[PDB]
Design a protein around this nucleic acid. Sequence first.
RNA 1: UUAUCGGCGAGACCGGGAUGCACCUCCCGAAGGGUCU
DNA 2: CCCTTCGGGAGGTGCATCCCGGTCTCGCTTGGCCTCC
DNA 3: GGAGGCCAAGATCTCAATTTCGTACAAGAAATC
Lengths: 104, 117, 343
Amino acid sequence: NMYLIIDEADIFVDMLEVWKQRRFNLRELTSAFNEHIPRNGVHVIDQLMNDVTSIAGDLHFCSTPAAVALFDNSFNALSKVGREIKNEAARKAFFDCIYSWEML
Amino acid sequence: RWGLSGKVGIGNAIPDGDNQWGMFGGGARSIMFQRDESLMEFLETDQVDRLERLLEEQAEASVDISQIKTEQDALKKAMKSADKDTKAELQIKVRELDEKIQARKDQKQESRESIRR
Amino acid sequence: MRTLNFNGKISTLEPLTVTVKNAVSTSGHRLPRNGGFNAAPYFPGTSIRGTLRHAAHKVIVDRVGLNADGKSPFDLAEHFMLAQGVDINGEAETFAPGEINAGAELRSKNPLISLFGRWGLSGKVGIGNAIPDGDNQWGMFGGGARSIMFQRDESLMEFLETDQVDRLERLLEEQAEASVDISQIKTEQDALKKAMKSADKDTKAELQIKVRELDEKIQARKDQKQESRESIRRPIDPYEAFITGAELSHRMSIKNATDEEAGLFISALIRFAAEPRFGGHANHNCGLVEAHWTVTTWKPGELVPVTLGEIVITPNGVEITGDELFAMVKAFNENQSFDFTAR
RNA sequence: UUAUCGGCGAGACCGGGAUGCACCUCCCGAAGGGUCU
DNA sequence: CCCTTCGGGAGGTGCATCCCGGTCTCGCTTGGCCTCC
DNA sequence: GGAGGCCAAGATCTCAATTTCGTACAAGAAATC
């Protein structure tokens, strides 16, 4: 029934190039697993949370070499935490989540 | 020696097990006279006056150095969220703050250094 | 006449370091990076090759044997040929036609030269780079500070005469004055280079010769100092080395190796295992290695290699596995028909 | 567009040698204490 | 509730190779000669 | 014996040599799957 007028489609695409993103929010992942929480690993998540702010700065997306290197390193340093979740079902859910992130 | 190879190589000491390292020392130097009052009885009244002017000047230097460091670390947060090549001017500013701190130190007569540190 | 691949790992018992001119910069001693600036560092295959070549040279020297006084028959030119492959007499021609078929006899009678070639003769041995397996397996070590002996320990002052304590006082005052001078001139030089950053391309050269003027003035304030040329007290900049226990994958090939050449190579491995020191920093005992190699051979036309055996070098000993490695070592030991005094 | 349409092609190992290493103690100063069946 | 220390001294030199070895062609007709129809 | 095909011969000549390098940021809105 509806028709679509995307006024200012130039900015639409330009920021679509941002919207082509899924924010793996470590605070959200920290908040998501609040019962199966290997709290010792939080430091790693906290250290990575610092690094993102250092590379990302004030940008929602930043193309310095650090960003992809930190992306791989963060998920490897999260794979370290992957062997810390105690509940096996939660561990596999976490493993599958990062695996989906890893393959994506 | 310089240019003569030394036959001896003294390797590094590598711990065997995990852990086996941690923070030692610590503590804090203190004012003797709040630790033991008996030393008041050896010091002459003029030296008691000197020690109490030393306490008051050390404590006022402390509080004002402290608020200074507090704005300094809020500025360090600004630097942690500043841009590239704009932080070098804030760093000139920080070095100036530092100089100022060391001058505030200098112009404190004898006890330039915080005692209860 | 078969290809031997030593594929294996070097475990670093002590930190492993090297100083390659291109790798190092104004920062300090830094390992090569295996690519760009931030690439994972690797230990040069050149350092490993040189260490094993000198080990093999010592092996050949011992095998030929030393006269009563302890001297080796080889000429100095022969020592350089065997261990570094430089013809000091300059009689090595690169593409002289007549040596085209003398290469086979030269290799047969000089197994070391066949193994480690020379200028004009291809080396059958290719000693590859050692690349770490894991990440963050390197670091800055050796950071230090030379300190006045008589200020760290005062008991050494009672051993100095009056004129020598006065010498130490003149030296300390010259060091403090030199220091204040070189420090103010370097604290103007560093801001002058922090202005060279935003520089008009032409002005690059002018600020550069200003830097070289300041450097000449630092070197004349150093040539002015009477007591000492270099200040005794100083921080030693650390060097970059692989961490202790780092596992570095290593790959060495002996192309078309005869039994005796591979035997000489294994003897070189053993004699290097006597002193498993790679790279440099012999002070701080850097370079000590525990390396194990799987020797695999590959007959051309075969689809799979055959693992002849394993060469394990540990501080507790050299373990050789496989009958073939023993056979090659024995063949090298028993072949008396080698001549190294003649290239 | 002063006409008409026309593959340029076939072959070559550039390789051969080298330890970058040699010297440095980073140390010196300190009680964190008092407070509550 | 205190209060976070000053500094000191940042190298000296070496040595930067030798040598090869750089192509055929072909843009047209024509007959002489040598084999096949 | 005529008709295809392969190969050698035919006159001298017309002309000119680069010397690597891009590009250097901000924020619009949000019940996100």
